[PDB]
C-alpha cells in the first residue's frame, strides 16, 4: 500500500544495498532463500512488510529493487554469493565497460544501452504497486556511473512520473580524503543536473564515518563493511514509519515539505548518535537527552562540516524504541535554550518529530550493540556552503589549466558545460549566503 | 567482458612474456598443458580477460609474437610454458633488423606487419568488449622499436576508441647494452607519445639496484629482472580479473594519470620486496608497503622523483586490508612531502583495492607515478643524440633504407618540446 | 608583440524571426555585453576589447561591414607589409551570420573581399620598376585531425579525399606535403577558387539544420617583396615573405542534445578537442605578452601545429565571434561568449 523503490547505482550503492537488504531481511524474519519461517508456523501476518518486499503465491518475498553498475565485478558477487536466490535475476550487469570515472561516459556513451532497460524494470514494479511514494536512489559523487548515470536517471524520473518523491543518499566528497583526482568535476556537473529534478538529497562523508568509528566504536582498522551498516541503519530509521507501527508516523512525503524551504537548498545532513560498542554499551543510561544532545554534537556528525560555523533551517528527528514524547519535548527545549546552536529568524519551529515502537536490530558479525532506543537526525544547515566552496576552488584550480578535459570532450562534452555548470553552483553558494541573513522590520 | 591482446616483439618482449604468462598461469591455475588444476573458483570467472577456450577444457592465451628472427621464438617453444601458445601465432620472418630502426619500420617490417594484423583481427573479433592492447618492447633495439611502433600506429587507426599500453624498456644512463640506443629510442618516442594512452617506462639499472640492495641477490639474471615487470603487469590488470572493495581498470587510471595527452610516461613500482632471510624481521602492513613504494630504491624508471614534482599518482593494492589505512597514509604522504607534489591538483593520488592477493603474500601493493623527473631520461637522449647527429656518425645505415634527415630533426624537436612541457611544472 | 584583439558581433533579426516574433535577450552598454534571460532569474555580463552592435541601424556605435574591416583586419595588412605573419579567426554556430561577416553579400561585402581589394590597391600604389609583389595562395581543411586540400577535384567514386600529412622543417617551420598553390592578381581569381573550395568542403545535418560546417578551413596567402637594390652589379634581391591566414572554424556541438551517433560523434569530439587546444594557445599567448614564461602546446592539434609560425613570435592574431540575439538560441550563444572571453583572459 505504501511502497518505495530502491535504485542502487554503482559499486557504492550496491554494497550499501547488500547491507540494507541484510538488515531489512533480518528484521522481518526473511531468510536469504526468500522465505518466512514464521508464516508457515503461526499461519498469518505480514511482518514481511510490503513497502519493500513483494510476494508471490509460493511463499516467497522478492525485493522491490534493481541494481545497475555498468560493470560485472560487483553484481557477480551477489549472483554467486549469499543473496543469490532472493533478488530477481533482472539486475543490470551490463559489464561492457566502466564509466572510467568520466561523467561523459556514464551520461551519453555508456549511459545509453542500459537506461531503456532500467526504465522498463522500474515500470514493472510501479505497475505492481498501488500507493507508491518515493525513489530511494543510492549513488556516489565522483564515480562515472554514480554521477552521470544517476543524473540521467533523475532526468528520466521527472518526465515520466512527475508528482512523486525522488530522494538521494550520496557520498559527498571528503575535503582531504579522495579516491580520485576528478571527483570535483563530476560532483559539480552532477549538482547542476540533480537540482531541478531531485526533491531531497541526503549527504555523507566517509572521512566522518572513519572518525566516528575510531572514536565511538573503538575500531582502528575499519572498512566498508563497517560503514555501510551504519548507513543501512540511517536508511532503516528513515523508512520505518512505512513498515512498522508507532505513535507518530512520518512518511517520505513529509521530509521534502519540512526540510526543503526553497527548491535549491535540498542538501541536508544525517546523523545517528548511539554508535557505541558492547563495552561502551554499558556504563551509559541511553536516555533521550543524551542522544538528542549527541546528534548536534560535532565529531558525531557524518559530514566534516562544523555546524557552529553556520546556522540551521530545519531538523527532522526520527526516533525508535522505548521513547516517551515528554523526554523529546524536554530535549528540544534544552537544545533551543543554548546559544552555540543558532537558528534562523524565520523558522522558530525548526523541528519535526517521528516515533516508532520497534527497536533496531543487531547484525551478527557487526560492531554496534543492542539498544532499547535509537535516533536519526536529518538536519539542513547553512554550514555546507563551506564544502561547496572548497569543492569549487579545486574545480577552478584545475579548469584554469584545463586538465582532465580531453577525456570529457572525447565522449561528448563540448567546452561550455564545464563553464556553464560552475556558474550554476555560484548561485547556490549565494542563496545559502542570502538565507543566513536576519530580516529587517 | 574486458579483454586484452598481448603483443610482444623482440629479444626483450619474448623473454618477458615467457615469464609473464608463467606468472598469470600460476595465478589462474593453468599448467603447461593448458589445463586447469586450481583449488578455488574465482580463477575461472574472468579467465577470458586474457585466455581463450578450447575443446577439452583447455585454455590458450591471446599472445602475438612478432620477432624478425626465430632464434628467440625457438627458445619459448622449447621451454616450460611454450606448448600452450597458438602455433599459428608464432609469427616471424628472416633477415633480422640488425639493430636498425629503419629495417624494422620501413623495409623488413612492412613485409610482415600485415601478417600480424591478420592475427590481431582474429583475436579481437572473437572478443565481446575489448578494453585495449598490451605490448612489451625494448627501445634502442630493432624489431621491438620499429615494428612495435608500426603496430601501434596501425592499431590506433582501426581501434582508436580502445586502450594501447606498452611496457617499454627504455635505455639506461651509465652502460649502453646497444650502441644505437638514442637514434632508435628518439624515433620510438616520436611515434609513441602521439599514439599511446599509458606507457610504462622501465629501465634495467634500476632493476639491478633493486635486486642487489633490497632482495640481496648476488647473481641477478634477466629471468629475475623480468620477474618484476610481470608482477607490475599483473597488478595493473588485477581488478579487471578479480573483485575488490573499490574496483579500477586501465581507462580509469588513464583518466586520472593523464592530465594532458602527451604526458603519459610513468614510473612503475611493486611491493613488498625483501630478502629470503629478512622476511622474518618485517611487518606486513599498509604503511610499510607505502614506505617501500614511495622510496626511490624501488622505482624502475632509473630516475629520482626527489628531483621532480609528482603530477599524478595511482596505487593498486591486493589483499584483505582496511581502507582507512590507505586514505590516511596517502593524505599523510601528500601532507609531509608536499614539495614533491603539485598544487594546482589538490589530490594527486588515487586508490584501487582487490581482495584476492598473490599466491604467497597476505597482502601486496603496486604503484604508478607520473613525475617531472623523467625528463632526465630524454634530456640525456637528446644530449646523446645530437652529439652524434651534429656530424652524422652512424646515419648512413638509415638513409640507405629509405629515410631522410628531416625525420630525425622532427623527433629531436618533439622530445625537447616535451621536456619543456614537463619543466613548466617543475619550479 | 603578440596580441589577440577579441571581438563580438551581434546580428539583427532576420525576416523569419521578425515574422515569428523572436524575443531579445542580448543588450549593450558601451563595452559591456549583457545577456538577459526571458524570465529566468539573472543576467551575465561580458567585457571584450572590441564590440560590434549591429542590432539596430539607428543606435550609436553601429558597426557596419566597413568598420569591422577598419578596426580588426587593416592593422594586420599594415603589419603584413612590414614582413610579419598574421592570423584571423572566426567562431560561431550556424545562424549567427559568420558568412555575412567574412564573405558577405554582393552588395554588403564582408572582411575577405575588402581585405583583398585594399591589398591589391596598395600593391599598385606601392609598385615600381625595381620592387614587385607576387602572391600565391592555398585553401585546405581539417577533418578528424586529417588534412585535406579543397582546390583539387574528386573523382566519381567512393572518395578521392587524400589525407596529406604534416611535417616539420628545421628552419622555416611546419608545413603540408602536397599543398597546391596558385597565383592571384585580381580578386576574381580568389573568388573562383573559394567558389570551388567551399563546394568541396565537408558539411552535413545532425539534428537542427541541413546546411552546416563540420571542418575547419584555412585560406592562406603567401606574399613576397622581390626588390632589387645594390649599386655594385644590380643584384642582391633582398626578398621578404609574409604568411596571412584567414581560418573559418566550426561549431562546438553539445552532442547529447543532438543524440549524435556514428560519423557525427567523432567529428564533434575532434572539433571540440581542437577548440580546447586553441583556447589554451590564445590564453597562453596573451599571458606571454605580459612578460611571463610559459609553454604553448601547438602539437596537440593539426591546426595549431600548422600555424606555429603565424600566431607566436612577432605576429598578430585576431578573433571575431558571432552570436544571435534571439531567445530560442541562448545555450549555444552563452558558450561563444564564454569561449571568446577566456580567449581574452
Ligand atoms: C616463504 C615465502 O614467503 O616465499 C616468498 C618469498 O620469499 C618472497 C621473498 C618472494 C620471492 O620472490 C623473489 O625472491 C624474487 C624477487 C625478484 C625476482 C625473482 C624472485 C618468491 O620467490 C616469489 C613468491 O612471490 C609470490 O608471492 C607469488 O608466488 C609470485 N609468483 C610468481 O612470481 C611465480 C613465478 C614463477 C612461477 C610461479 C609463480 C607472484 C608475485 C606477484 C604477482 C604474481 C605472482 C613468494 C611469495 C615467495 C617466493 C616464492 C620465495 C618475493 O616475491 C615477489 C614477487 O614479491 C620476493 O620478495 C617477495 C617477498 C616474498 O617473501
Ligand atoms: N560508503 C561507501 N562508499 C563507497 C563504497 N564503495 C565506493 N564508495 C565511494 O565511491 C567513490 C568512487 O566512486 P565509485 O565507487 O567508483 O562509484 P561507481 O559508480 O562505481 O563509479 P565507476 O567506478 O566509475 O563506475 C569513492 O570515493 C568511495 O568513497 C562503499 O562500499 N561504501
Ligand atoms: N629486461 C630485459 N632486457 C633485455 C632482455 N634482452 C634484451 N634486453 C634489452 O633489449 C635491448 C636490446 O634490444 P633487442 O631486444 O636485442 O632488439 P630487438 O631484438 O630488435 O628487439 C637492450 O637494451 C637490452 O638491455 C631481457 O631478457 N630482459
Ligand atoms: Mg565503478
Author numbering:
A (entry chain A): 1 to 441
B (entry chain B): 1 to 427
C (entry chain K): 391 to 735
Paper lines:
KIF14 is a microtubule-based motor protein with essential roles during cell division. KIF14 belongs to the kinesin-3 family of motor proteins. As all kinesins, KIF14 possesses a highly conserved catalytic motor or head domain that contains nucleotide and microtubule binding sites, and where ATP hydrolysis is coupled to the generation of mechanical work. Here we report the near-atomic resolution structures of twenty KIF14-microtubule complexes corresponding to five distinct KIF14 constructs in four nucleotide conditions mimicking four key steps of the ATP hydrolysis cycle.
Construct K743 includes 8 neck-linker residues. To investigate this issue, we obtained the cryo-EM structures of microtubules in complex with the constructs K735 and K743 that have truncated neck-linkers. We surmised that an absent or truncated neck-linker would mimic the situation when the neck-linker is mechanically pulled out from the docked configuration as it may occur under force or in a two-heads microtubule-bound intermediate. In the Apo and ADP states the motor domain structures are very similar for all the complexes investigated; this is regardless of whether the KIF14 construct contained a truncated or a full neck-linker, they all conform to the open configuration. All the KIF14 microtubule-bound structures in the ADP or Apo states are very similar with the motor domain adjusting to the open conformation. All the microtubule-bound KIF14 open structures have the more twisted β-sheet conformation, regardless of the nucleotide species in the active site. Consistent with the structural results, we found that the K735 and K743 constructs have reduced microtubule-stimulated ATPase activity relative to the longer KIF14 constructs.
